Amino acid sequence: PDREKALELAMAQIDKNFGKGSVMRLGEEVRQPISVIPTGSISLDVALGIGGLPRGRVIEIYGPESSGKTTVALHAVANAQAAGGIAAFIDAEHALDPEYAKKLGVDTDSLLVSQPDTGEQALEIADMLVRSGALDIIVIDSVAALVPRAEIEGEMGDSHVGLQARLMSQALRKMTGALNNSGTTAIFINQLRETTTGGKALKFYASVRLDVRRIETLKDGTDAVGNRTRVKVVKNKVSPPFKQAEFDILYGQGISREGSLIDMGVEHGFIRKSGSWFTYEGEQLGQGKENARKFLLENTDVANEIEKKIKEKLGIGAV
Numbered sequence: 304p305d306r307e308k309a310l311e312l313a314m315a316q317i318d319k320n321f322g323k324g325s326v327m328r329l330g331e332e333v334r335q336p337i338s339v340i341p342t343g344s345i346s347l348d349v350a351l352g353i354g355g356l357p358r359g360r361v362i363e364i365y366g367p368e369s370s371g372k373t374t375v376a377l378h379a380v381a382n383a384q385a386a387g388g389i390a391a392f393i394d395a396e397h398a399l400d401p402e403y404a405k406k407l408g409v410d411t412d413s414l415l416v417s418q419p420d421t422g423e424q425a426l427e428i429a430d431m432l433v434r435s436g437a438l439d440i441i442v443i444d445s446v447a448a449l450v451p452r453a454e455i456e457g458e459m460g461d462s463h464v465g466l467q468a469r470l471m472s473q474a475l476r477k478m479t480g481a482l483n484n485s486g487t488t489a490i491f492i493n494q495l496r497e498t499t500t501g502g503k504a505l506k507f508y509a510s511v512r513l514d515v516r517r518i519e520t521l522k523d524g525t526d527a528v529g530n531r532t533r534v535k536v537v538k539n540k541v542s543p544p545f546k547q548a549e550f551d552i553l554y555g556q557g558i559s560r561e562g563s564l565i566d567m568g569v570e571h572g573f574i575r576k577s578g579s580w581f582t583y584e585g586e587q588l589g590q591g592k593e594n595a596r597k598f599l600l601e602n603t604d605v606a607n608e609i610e611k612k613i614k615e616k617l618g619i620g621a622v
């Protein structure tokens with residue numbers, strides 16, 4: 304017996320029997336290119352291993368309210384529109400702020416929005432839109448808001464089953480295949496407090512599952528500026544999972560580009576961080592992540608070069 308060789312034949316038949324990524328090495332480096340939709344976050348893009356959200360797949364983005372999950376979904380939509388794609392938004396929360404969405408670069412006017420009367424209707428409409436192959440991405444707001452018609456139409460405490468999770472199951476079962484044929488990325492948003500009853504099946508049907516969470520409150524000096532989010536890619540059937548990313552989302556703003564640059568530039572050594580002060584190729588950036596953010600904001604030439612440097616090192620800029 305020659306373990307490594309017996310192992311390859313094993314993993315080969317596993318992937319062949321159940322698909323690419325059925326089993327992989329955490330430390331491997333996937334060259335499977337696969338057509339993604341940039342998450343609007345460079346670090347998150349890298350964490351996913353393929354530059355963004357894989358297309359034709361089910362993506363789940365769960366986490367507590369106000370942790371950044373809609374922002375990622377919106378940024379995702381925007382990048383898909385910019386690349387000439389058509390976007391759909393199955394809304395059952397009635398929270399969306401098109402004004403904020405435009406700010407993140409979304410073309411709201413061309414955005415399809417549906418506000419379904421029940422969970423069945425919601426999924427059914429999404430399934431119908433998907434099968435026209437016209438969409439590049441479709442976002443479903445609130446897995447939890449997908450309450451069965453039976454529950455909606457007031458019905459007795461009798462015959463009360465875990466119908467919502469069944470609903471989400473059958474729905475995901477038939478939709479996933481279409482999503483594959485269509486190549487449409489379907490982001491399910493799980494604002495959670497079973498993962499909201501329906502997140503049960505979503506756990507098995509997703510090719511990617513992002514754990515969005517808010518960790519810090521960007522204070523800059525000593526006042527509210529934005530908030531730092533951390534996303535853990537808990538499931539990734541297209542790359543080695545378990546990676547992590549972090550990013551700033553200033554108030555009323557989307558994911559900070561400069562913020563990302565300052566973070567990855569530091570860790571990747573392109574930008575030196577002496578305690579308190581930041582420097583790049585011997586240029587002074589400022590004393591304070593925020594001053595540095597401002598600096599990079601104003602000196603668009605720097606940052607663009609830093610982005611280049613950081614980009615080059617790890618694949619390249621998104622689409």
Ligand SMILES: Nc1ncnc2c1ncn2[C@H]1C[C@H](O)[C@@H](COP(=O)(O)OP(=O)(O)OP(=O)(O)O)O1
Nearest residue numbers: 367368369370371372373374400403494552554555
């Ligand atoms: N309408 C808005 N006005 C100002 N800032 C906003 C707005 N929407 C989002 N943001 C910014 C600041 C928020 O602290 C940050 C995170 O909120 P959001 O992305 O909605 O979190 P979330 O997606 O985890 O919540 P949920 O998914 O429950 O809606 O995004």
